[PDB]
Amino acid sequence: HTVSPVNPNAQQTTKTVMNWLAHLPNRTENRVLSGAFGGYSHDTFSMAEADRIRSATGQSPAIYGCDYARGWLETANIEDSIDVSCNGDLMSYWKNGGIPQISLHLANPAFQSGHFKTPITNDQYKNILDSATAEGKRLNAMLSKIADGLQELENQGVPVLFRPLHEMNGEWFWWGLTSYNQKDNERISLYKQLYKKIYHYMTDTRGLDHLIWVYSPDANRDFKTDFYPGASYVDIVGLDAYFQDAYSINGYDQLTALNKPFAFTEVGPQTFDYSLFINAIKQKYPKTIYFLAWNDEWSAAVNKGASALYHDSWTLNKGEIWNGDSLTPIVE
Template identity: 40%
Template sequence: MLRRLRTALISALLLLPLLATAPSAVAATAAPSDPQATPAAAQALDWLAQLPNRAGNRVLSGFFGGYSGSTFSADRTTTDGQPTQLGKLQTATGQNPGLLACDYAANGSSSIDTSCNSGLINWWQQGGLASVSFHAPNPAQPTGGLFVHLDDFAQITDPTTAVGKQWHATLDQVAAGLQQLDAAGVPVLFRPLHEMNSTYQQAFWWSGQQRSDFIAVWRNMYTYLTQTKGLHNLLWVYSSLCDTSDPAGYYPGAAYTDIVGLDCYPADPSAAQGYDAMTALGKPFAFAEIGAPTDNNLTPPAADPNSFDFRRWSDAIHHRYPATSYFLSWNDSWGLTQQIPDGAKALMNDPWTVNLGELDRSARTEAAGPARPADPVELLNGFETGADGWTAYNQANGPLQVNEWSSQGSSSLRADTDLSQQKQLFLYHHGQFDLSAYATLSAAARTAPGGNQAGGATAKLYLRTGSGNAWYDSGATVIGPDGVMLTVSLAGIPNLNDVHDIGVDFTPATGATGPASVYVDDVTAARPATLLADFETGVEGWSNWQTINSVPWSVTEWAATGTHSLKSDVMLDQRHESILNRHYSTPTDLSGHLTLSVTARTAPWGNQAGGTTAKLYLRTGPSCSGPLTWYDNRGQSVDSNGTRLFLNLGGIPNRDQVCEIGVDFVPAKGASGQSSIYLDNATLR
């Protein structure tokens, strides 16, 4: 199958007619899943999505205020003057959380209570954000059935069934509460049916269901609340349990989700599993519940007070989970106020933490990097919003934006043809383009499986330049239903600042007959690479940290290019990161580049368990001997085949003050034995 191109700078370069130079990178807008979302909801989501890209305050603090009508309070003291849990938090840390959450249904309750709304409205008016979850009553056993598996789960979408009728009655009560918040102008981070992937003995009635059934129930609930009930103030939070199998396996889809999160209570936050799977979904990420560790589920015997240091969470977010938009601490014995006081104070006063009074919900920030790793290419046309100015020649129909096939994203461009006519079909974009800064031009091309293709159609990616419209192409390549990547080297082509046409020429095989379709997707341009290190002559100034060897060395046993790579040995069962890096004594200027890339590898020996994750990073600062700010690509799985890592530099502040670049290798939980890590071919584009 065609390798999917992961392109990062869509908004940085959309080549349109008359565009002469590429604009500087700008932050991408996070659009709500609900097209009718209120302006306040859209603004809140965009702010949260951009928050991790800040150089300073970048993670919103959150706190669970309690169960509505039971333990919830947005006040700092009770009516008799005793401190509430929120009041204890303020006393212990000097801070109030930026996000306050309540639950419409206490554990085991058979009814919905929405009296916490007044506190959430007040919190919003103070400048904070609000979140609502509900430990939904079991529609087959409303009293005491929270942890009783519902065998008729799929039926709850049908209100003519007994469980469906009860479920919709619950949703109606929830909707009434959410409508009060909507009327007050409050956007809500709405977190229903959390921890759906739990396999613990006391899992919720909706946990561990058939994945297709869960997705259908979520989507039905989404449609019911947004369309039937007209609730457009909701930001939908999909929150699974960390350290449990496949946290993204129940994901209902981008059109039904705004934020993805993990509920996480590990003894070692830096070892929690699930972050990479969730951030790969491309949505803002949060730790939707954190707390002191428990035995094996979320309703255990109380954790020992003053036993857990929340500085572990601060360190983990800095070094393991920098894409985190917010964390939400649970209360009671799991909460900040019941544990080591200095740890709670450190987390709430961490330089990255944003508390109440520090939110600017209308602020925008420049993007420091994509949610997922990006190739060193720039998207010219991806056809996600239409034909993008492309047209066709010799077609029977089209061109059409379609979603029946794509090499990246969800859409591509299609044109229909009659193979029997033996005509060349052209899909192309006519305009004036400047490709002088680029080294290659590429596009994905495909034919539909229909029709008699005979020997198979061929395709050429081409461009025409200069006053004479000189033609240059990739050469004819046989294509089929799996698709191929066509590439033109731009080296030596004159007049690249005066390109008039970019297109694909499809030619049917002799003897082909019948109707067929052709497709184009992901037209991209790549900048020339600047080599930083290939280790052909030694370590080239690179060093290591937390490895067996005191220094790395250049070896010939593996290489991504050339004959050498950089190697160091590691112990997997120590469960700590190992780093290969290049530290500069004075700041280095990378401001003229868009992408940093390197190939990373692990040796095939050692028990890799779930596989090692590698993060390509850089650190910036005005002095390379002083405090530095960390930016990374949020991690990719690497193995003995080698994986190309990419870090989008667009939007990273102070790119003229780079003091360190490197790769942080993190072994999987359960990994053991000795292994080795490698790097090769570090480049800039």
């Protein structure tokens, strides 16, 4: 069968990559893309983690991540928290046989700037969703700058794993719940409204056809599927998973039950041997199509088992996506 991006107008390369990703679990090898977070644009983003992995393993992560939004920063205009200068490196990563991933630690448009982990009321959340308000204008200012950045990548035909509004079932970011494991049906409904608002801004208003849309709840909180905006708005589902024991991560059955390709959209030690993580994928989470190790203390290069992780027969690394001018063959 053919798995198509939820954006029916998606670029051919993005279409081909999405279908290819969906068929990885039919393989006996090269069926889980490695990944690493490279950092926050114009703050911590660099190629240093990729290079540490090359040095330790002789291989590079298939996926390299950047985050555009430094949402803790106090700035004159809220959109100043967005920087897209990591694009050059992301485009080179694609040209050199990998794939970019972009997340957003968005500043909080309820307020003048910053406050990414300061909670808001449902009333404020409604203002944010209303383009006529001071709040909604701040959100749109941020979305416009993000889209300007994404446009750069679209112009070079670069598919992007785009992972907005993550960990929404957590109680830290402004866009999620306000209280630990406390259901709020209006908040859940408002989240879906915000997700769909961003989807339609990027896809319709800005015509961005190179985005693969990733839904990434936290593995250590309830309501993992309650926030799911639906089959027509999500390409890949996954867990942000920080754990001590790779074999007891919660949520795989629930998310795979949505019949979407599944990924470990973030991974790291909770505080650790990454070789046990790939082993656990084979036994417990076989439909995993990729993992993205976080940076700093969580990274593969600074923990045990980097070589075993990267050299495992299941692990698909930079340079193993393409065979010349076409993707490596699909197993149907």
